[PDB]
């Protein structure tokens, strides 16, 4: 089924010092690709060293504690960052039925 995700919440002030603390646990699943393929891994190139860039989609239950501008840690150790408000967060325009699912474009850096 689903797997628990550690969420870190924090708002940067004018001093530019982030203050991220534990906000609880959220249940969600990851999707490394929009369709039948997978997203390519970015190359830092300019950065001195070696790294990778990834943009995935996170599926979470409606009305979850997760919110944009937060940090997400998986069960293996990698830490991701989610940005941007949730998409498809509305009911059916014709009838009003609710799927209860939203997509988060989480950026994978580890």
């Amino acid at each position: 089924n689903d797997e628990t995700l550690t969420v870190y919440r924090g708002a940067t002030d004018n001093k530019g010092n982030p203050n991220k603390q534990v906000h609880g646990t959220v249940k969600g699943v990851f999707a490394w690709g929009p369709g039948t393929s997978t997203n390519k891994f970015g190359r830092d190139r300019n950065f001195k060293g070696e790294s990778s860039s990834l943009t995935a989609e996170l599926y979470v239950k409606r009305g979850a504690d997760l919110k944009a501008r937060d940090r997400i840690r998986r069960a293996n150790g990698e830490e991701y960052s989610v940005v941007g408000h949730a998409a498809w967060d509305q009911g059916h325009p014709f009838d009003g039925f609710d799927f209860g699912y939203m997509v988060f474009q989480v950026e994978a850096v580890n």
């Binding site: 998409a87 498809w88 059916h92 325009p93 009838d95 039925f97 799927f99 699912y101 997509v103």
Partner: protein, 137 residues
Amino acid sequence: AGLATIDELQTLMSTVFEDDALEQAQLVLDIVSSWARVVSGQMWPDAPANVPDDVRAVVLQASRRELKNPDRVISRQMGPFNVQYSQPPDGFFYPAELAILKRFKRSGGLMTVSTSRGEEGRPWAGKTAYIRYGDGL
């Protein structure tokens, strides 16, 4: 009417009904109870007193299929998420559910109608012409 209550429906749907949602659910449940009553043919004077578990199951299921997916839809999708339902029944109850409701009908349901040849009948033309020839006993 009202064969089923609203608490067990709330538990079945795992949600709570409030504001117009409660009124809509109550109206749907009353409609379904009336349909089940007319299909079965019984009256159930004390509605939430006897109310066998079969009719409770039928009305709860029909209320669920009415509250969720009100207008009959096969496939409904918005964006990446998609869902396709089965073939909706003609009425609020599936053909399998109708058999359970028709259980309470008398006999096997093969009721008959008494026809006639447009005749009233007078079974006395020939009997009242007899004249009493005895002692009046």
